[PDB]
Subunit: 155 residues, 2 copies
């Protein structure tokens, strides 16, 4: 009836740098490959700020409206809830927490993204949820590439 | 700039049965899981015939317009081309063939499906193809499920 799943990604870059990008609720296109532009109505980073995402051309969907639900600069957590948009996903919530770990002897970040979303009418978990897992996996993969180029650029 | 890939499915049912379903160009609902309605204009399944597919509710796209390109009852090939719909898929074309096999001392069918589609611009092949492979793997796995249940039912009719 509803599907929750958790995606994990190891990143070869320092936590503060990774947070610096993740934390931008007004700039998801920073690393999310399917976003074209983003507009935040109100003060960009408060809990309750709505954003209006425009996806890129030639994808199944074109727009998404999302609400920032948690931004914790302390425990490094970011929660959103999608609330509208032509993708037709219903009741989607997603949290990304960021933990400090050590990868290949140097400092690194674990990304943990959880999400919950209703399985559409007439379709099974087995048909649907691997698409949502894929998108996020892709989103995290891109965060890694982006952050690591940034951490490499610093040298 | 183009996304090309082939998928494979080993199905535990006779070829006559799988083809029985797969050749149904007017009813991809029989096994494809996202499809709600299929209208076919004029001739049912003759090369050139077009189908308007309606997707089920709550999905990122609602309609697809596809064309029958190959229907071969003898060689067991079904080729289609998508030419419209709101999935925004550009130059999608797919083709599926069914082949007979004897594996583990029990008859069966290998299905093998190859697709080709344009990659959305401003996105890379890496970010986008696995999505198309996955949907097809999804249809293939479903085909095995549907087909194999039918075999089991038929084998239940043992008297």
């Amino acid at each position: 009836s509803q599907c929750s799943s958790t995606l994990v990604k190891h990143i070869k870059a320092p936590l503060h740098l990774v947070w610096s990008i993740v934390r931008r609720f007004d700039e998801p296109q920073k690393y999310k490959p399917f976003i074209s532009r983003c507009v935040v109505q109100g003060k960009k980073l408060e809990v309750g700020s709505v954003r209006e995402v425009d996806l890129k051309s030639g994808l199944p969907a074109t727009k998404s409206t999302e609400v920032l639900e948690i931004l914790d600069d302390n425990e490094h957590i970011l929660g959103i809830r999608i609330v509208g948009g032509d993708h037709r996903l219903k009741n989607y919530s997603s949290t990304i927490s960021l933990h400090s770990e050590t990868i290949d002897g140097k400092t690194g970040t674990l990304a943990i993204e959880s999400f919950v979303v209703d399985v559409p009418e007439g379709n099974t978990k087995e048909e649907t949820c691997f698409f949502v897992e894929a998108l996020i996996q892709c989103n995290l993969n891109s965060l890694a590439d982006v952050t690591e180029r940034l951490q490499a650029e610093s040298m």
